[PDB]
Amino acid sequence: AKEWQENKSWNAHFTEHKSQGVVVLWNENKQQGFTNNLKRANQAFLPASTFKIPNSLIALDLGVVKDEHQVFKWDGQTRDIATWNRDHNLITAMKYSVVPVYQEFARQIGEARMSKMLHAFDYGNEDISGNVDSFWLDGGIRISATEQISFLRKLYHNKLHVSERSQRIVKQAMLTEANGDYIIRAKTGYSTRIEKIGWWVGWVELDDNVWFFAMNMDMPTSDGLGLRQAITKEVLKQEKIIPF
Amino acid sequence: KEWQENKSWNAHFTEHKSQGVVVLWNENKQQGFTNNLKRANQAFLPASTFKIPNSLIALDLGVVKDEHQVFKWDGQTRDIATWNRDHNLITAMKYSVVPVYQEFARQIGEARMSKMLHAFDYGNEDISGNVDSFWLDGGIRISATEQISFLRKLYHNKLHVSERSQRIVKQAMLTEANGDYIIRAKTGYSTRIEKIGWWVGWVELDDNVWFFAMNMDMPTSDGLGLRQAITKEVLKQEKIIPF
Ligand SMILES: [Cl-]
């Protein structure tokens, strides 16, 4: 039984944009996965921006974040992203990938509780070597695209070892697009520093099905998140998951 | 001033050969605005807007386990194509699947429905009529300003039901989201002939929430698109959402 099928025709979406990477899709109803590259789908990388999901979940479950309205005041330090130089709540911190807010969450969670929770989540290699407030950006943690799918499916089903409340709040914060045809929950691909790999992970909710996606790509000459989203959407449109 | 009348919004009703009221509430400033102070307080049958309290009560009482629970199609062909299939709470709200809400109301029953509407301080709290149709042809009445009060409690998880039930219904209400705003509504799609059509909900911005409740007299055709257009023309005029 092959729960993972390879479709090399999606490689054209990478080659036409002079890029190299993987797209992994999971059809929830059919319990079947699809990818352009099975080997790369299983290669583990630094989670970087995708770590906002487990970080926020742990912060809510432990009461570091009381609710999605609690204000995290700006520290007064001027940074190069204008949207970071203001107060935020969980929703806006996710919207604008406000790394200083997530660093504050990680410091409050602390090393021991962060490690215990990643082990409880079965999250990637569960290795958090590095500064407690930067290990997902320059430390020892690694996760593959197929492991991102397994983690996101548990989140979708409220099956992670954290409160149902924390899972519902994080899914609300992940909201990125909604129209009369579909909803996309993601808010995970923004790159805040130089990394070898960029990501885009999340899911597409349809009336009678959910399609999980996890993609990663090598750093190209100039393109980034916009391109990662474009290639993923080109694949979703090819598979008739979302309309053209 | 707490309440202000803005008659310039009447241009949006006149341009579309319509009559009605738009009520807006600025959460941060605790201030309300309307084109018609009298009509803002006039109470009407809630019709499609009743899916919000009906869903909340059904979830809190365990009639609906969660937003994924499947309500299987009974195999009976109905005259709204989207009703002739299985549904969950999300899609039943999306397609205003009256037979699903009727089954919720029959399970809730008269006594619990009345007690919960009293607990919610919902409109006139009068459920006179058939338990499975009173929000469509019975005694219940609610005004646009009362819709705002009810929605504000829901937004703040302040209704006398679990926080879980409130979070699930707010998820079901999701209708639009982009990089600028989120609209939670799913309350205006009507399949049954009524004297009044509605559109109620709210717009979430980065640092504020604007609640809205509008109603209009009905001539003919699929009025939802028109109700949404008038409301959005008002939101755009007040610079709440971009042009
Ligand atoms: Cl949502």
Curated annotation (Swiss-Prot), chain B:
Any one GO BP annotation for this protein: response to antibiotic
Domain of life (superkingdom): Bacteria
EC number of the protein: 3.5.2.6
Gene label: OXA-48
UniProt keyword annotation of Signal present: yes
Record field: catalytic activity: a beta-lactam + H2O = a substituted beta-amino acid
PROSITE patterns: BETA_LACTAMASE_D
Entry keywords, A to Z: Antibiotic resistance, Hydrolase, Plasmid, Signal
Cross-referenced Gene3D superfamilies: DD-peptidase/beta-lactamase superfamily
Post-translational modifications reported in the UniProt record: Carboxylated on the epsilon-amino group of a lysine, with the resulting carbamate functional group serving as a general base. Probably N-carboxylated at Lys-51 at neutral pH in vivo and undergoes complete N-decarboxylation, at pH 4.1, in vitro.
Name by which UniProt lists this protein: Beta-lactamase OXA-48
Summary of subunit composition and partner proteins: Monomer. Dimer.
Residues forming the catalytic site: S48 (acyl-ester intermediate)
Residue positions binding a beta-lactam: S48, K51, S96, R227
